[PDB]
């Protein structure tokens, strides 16, 4: 298990960013982050945590990707 990289192809496919504040995408809305995403398994991981859509990786709690969905 290791931190996901923004240039990993899997990351790119979902337009993932470690910092949501840097997202420029039509579906994005300010306030959406991995931290408040249903796929972010450990709601208490405030730094790096697992994500169902990225098996074997840790994503940034302050990040975002196109698969974002409210908890
Ligand atoms: S699916 Fe949710 S928790 Fe996983 S990277 Fe995308 S926004 Fe973050």
Q: What is the C-alpha end-to-end distance of the chain, expressed in Å?
A: 24
Query: Would you say 1 is a known binding-site residue?
Result: no
Write the burial class of residue 64 (CB in 10 Å: 0-12 exposed, 13-18 middle, 19+ buried): buried
Give the ligand 1 atom nearest the CA of 67.
Answer: 1
Find all residues with CB under 8 Å of 7, minimum gap 6, and list them: none
Give the position of tokens 């945590």.
Answer: 49
Tokens for 1?
């298990």
Which experimental technique did the depositors report for determining this structure?
Answer: X-ray
Instruction: Please answer whether residues 45 and 2 qualify as being in contact, where contact means their C-beta atoms are separated by less than 8 angstroms.
Output: no
What would you report as the CA-atom Rg of the chain, rounded to the nearest whole angstrom? 11
- Specify the fold of 1-71: High-Potential Iron-Sulfur Protein; Chain A (4.10.490)
Going from the Cα of 6 to the center of ligand 1, the distance in angstroms, rounded, reads 13
């Amino acid at each position: 298990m290791e931190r996901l990289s923004e240039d990993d192809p899997a990351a790119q496919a979902l337009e993932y960013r470690h910092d949501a504040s840097s997202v420029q995408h039509p579906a994005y809305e300010e306030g959406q982050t991995c931290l408040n995403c249903l796929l972010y398994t450990d709601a208490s991981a405030q730094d790096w945590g697992p994500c169902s859509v990225f098996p074997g990786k840790l994503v940034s709690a302050n990040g975002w990707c196109t698969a974002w969905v409210a908890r």
